[PDB]
Symmetry: D3
Subunit: 188 residues, 6 copies
């Protein structure tokens, strides 16, 4: 039984989760701060067999970010970003179908995760786990892990948001803790 | 009357909002990914006359982040960070007392904001405004703004979270959009 | 300023409201009861200046309903139904942007209404109103009314669902109380 | 042990579920649309061993509905409706005790079902199943099915509302698919 | 416009609020602890113009409480208690209609109050007030006050629960602060 | 061990809300005023940081003596015991996920209410009731156990009890002794 098979029938948002507002601010040609856009995000991507859907709220590709001439807006909207940006950031929102889990994987990045809706289980390759509820926050420091949606005993959708930042490779007594995607390669 | 006067009586979390779990992962001596800590955050800071309380969930001070030797954990924990870090990041969570307002201010940083609980109004120096509900997200590109907690017609606490990154100066018509701390009294 | 102007930026569902599952059941080759579809509904229509959006979950066009050959499914999906079907039914679900209100209007129709999310004010042409919270049910008997979304003091979206049934013209004191769209 | 045995101890609403407001509209002497009554429904019926309770919010016995002289109101109030009315409608709300389920059964009618509170499992005789959460909607086309309250892993009450309409009987392979009451 | 007029049309619970379970425990003749009842409370009383309904979850009439022969159970069930029992307790739960307000009154009693549902404003005769949300608790020490249901800008019902205990008369400057009920007097006659 | 080290910052437990406790009083002009707004009193970690209690008030005589604010002083000065003879205790407890109390009996009558979550109340006869938010229990000196079953043992829960003094429960000439249990 593939969990969440064909659950996400209408892209973002997944059934049972809320449509959002993303607001981007900026300056007009008089120097006044205004809103530039209100929308549903960007670069929506179905994951698995309609088991999840990702939503890229923003991205940057250099540090510090260049805002003049609105080049960061164009850069974020021009291309769908990869897993993570070197010297940059990605804000990726993913809706989980009931009981959907990620593969055990490692990205070489530092990730700030917050539970937007539902209950998620964060399982590391050691077997240690934490149950994260709405509002709880994780700082994933380039560790091998998998995310499991356990909301309402596996009957409810859930939503996570991650902010992915660039980090150097993790080295433990000579050896690189190399990145691997498992089955998440298909989505990127 | 000043809103939220003496409302936050026991730091974080503000009365009416939930205590949190912050989980930090890392590697043990065998290269296994483990949980290093589970706590309530860090560098709690009362704001105003007990009108709000901030919670620094993490911070970084270089790009890319250096993680080996747990150097990033030490830097985040040994100093209270400033408003924002150059070439770095700050995850700042803030509990608002009912009807509490930020000053009209500008930080020279790009901020990813999300409403964790409640309803907030984002007003910009042009007078343009958006009402942001739980789960809504704003991308603040070094703009002058204020945050207004309006939850339950101004009778309920609210919680925001921001991730502040470093950004270059914004130059409009050859003039720098200089950052400024506000003053609510003069408004 | 117009309430909820440009609020509904991505059709159904409105921002702050949940996507739905509509399940339609049927019969297979050997008479076993199965599921024929799971979807977001049908015939989504923006209303006003992106101030609301309707979703037609189902409709029938005769009484009693004819299910054989799945022709009822065909009738429901092949054309967008009108406001109200004669000798039939319409399941119309509508997401309201914050503080968006309906025009005072009358349809020759008996309406089963349920608040799916939010707080609504039902106002009749006499001035009488009832505030309806989530799960409350109204039976509109061809009366003239307007629906006002008041969720969270006019700052939150709301969702109503109606089932509209055909009724005979209502006569009060020898006068037929006529339908009107208002706007 | 029977699920939800004696759980419903004071009729409608079941413990843990909210009392409702049912509003009925009508016309007064001068043709003004007014509210006629606000109540808790009608024809409350305990089901099983106090394992559930049904609330009939409205019914009609003819299409189109006759509303003049409030005869539809008097008919809806005068007698407890049956499972479903020929050429008519029934608004039937039911509170489920924790873990309670219906018998596998078939009514020859087309039902619109919406989850009012809780989480329900809709199992068909083929074994196919869908989980329906709050606001999810089902169109039951005279199929054989079970309703199972699974709210909070079988420890919480749940509420469903159905609008049952008359339908012609479903014929498969030349065989009348006969409605049965199960248990 | 009188707030909450005719809102409570079916007693307890008020429309928009949940029906409750009240479990009472006891002993059988073998010393085993058993459940004696599960119900909707006791002594339901509509208040005002069907603007509120009260639900007496329990009461006691002596201290310490006598439980043998289940006599405490029968004393609580056989009679609707007054506002307050000398040397005893009352658990009073009250459903408010939208925007419904109690009169300014004083009970010579120490009351433990908890907001079960909604948002309430506790106003004392000094003009001071506190907004109490769900889970918030007050300890009312024979003070003059009123309760205001302000849930959802005055359009939603709310529920409070109180545990009233007996207290001595509060004297301030050799003058007893006398209890008074105002329009609440019609509700306990 | 359920909830081991879950309560990492005292009251409130992670996932549960901070409270306001308001105590009213009298002016020197006889005016009813607010004397304090706080987070309760006498917080106590229980188990291996598996639960935390919060004492909202307590009284030590019946009827209660409010003059001179002596009731406030007595409630604040010392942490109360399990229950007070001739008096009351308002005890709020946050439970970590899946945490259960021991099977035990106190010689008191307890008014319980679920503030948040889902709790199973188990009596020594094996009889149980699942109590949800808003449900109330009248514990008449019975041997019992409380189990936090919120969201299948994965969420915290909160109960509040008002404990009152009762006489010994004698069944067939034998006193039903209290015990703390294991
Ligand atoms: C097909 C089944 C799984 C689909 C959903 C996967 C989500 C979690 C994986 C993940 C992503 C997305 O690739 C990140 O962006 C980094 C973050 O830490 C974890
Ligand atoms: C006493 C009144 C002020 C307290 C209310 C909250 C203010 C939020 C201001 C803010 C901060 C904190 O300095 C940021 O980190 C950036 C973010 O956009 C707005
Ligand atoms: C842009 C502002 C107008 C749109 C807001 C929603 C209006 C609902 C009107 C309605 C319909 C749809 O036409 C029905 O299905 C009958 C039911 O009584 C009320
Ligand atoms: C003893 C426990 C079972 C009884 C409780 C609920 C059963 C609902 C069955 C049902 C009815 C009831 O008449 C309908 O009206 C059609 C609708 O599809 C399902
Ligand atoms: C019809 C207007 C009033 C309806 C709402 C009811 C409020 C009662 C307030 C109250 C009472 C009554 O005396 C108590 O039971 C003690 C406690 O302190 C507050
Ligand atoms: C092993 C970690 C702690 C387990 C959870 C604690 C339960 C509270 C026990 C209790 C008390 C205080 O001992 C009361 O106030 C009476 C009420 O019935 C149950």
């Amino acid at each position: 039984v593939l969990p969440g098979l064909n659950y996400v029938h209408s892209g973002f948002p997944a059934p049972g989760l809320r449509q959002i507002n993303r607001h981007i601010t900026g300056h007009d040609d008089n120097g006044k701060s205004v809103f530039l856009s209100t929308d549903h995000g960007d670069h929506h991507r179905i994951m698995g067999e309609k088991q999840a859907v990702a939503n890229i709220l923003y991205s940057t590709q250099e540090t510090p970010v260049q805002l003049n001439g609105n080049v960061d807006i164009d850069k974020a909207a021009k291309e769908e970003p990869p897993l993570h940006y070197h010297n940059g950031s990605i804000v990726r929102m993913i809706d989980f179908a009931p009981a959907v889990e990620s593969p055990l994987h490692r990205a070489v990045s530092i990730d700030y995760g917050i539970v937007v809706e539902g209950v998620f289980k964060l399982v590391l390759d050691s077997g240690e786990e934490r149950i994260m509820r709405q509002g709880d926050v994780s700082v994933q420091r380039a560790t091998a892990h998998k995310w499991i949606n356990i909301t309402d005993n596996g009957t409810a959708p859930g939503r996570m948001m991650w902010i992915l930042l660039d980090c150097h490779d993790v080295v433990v007594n000579g050896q690189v803790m190399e990145g691997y995607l498992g089955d998440l390669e298909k989505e990127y």
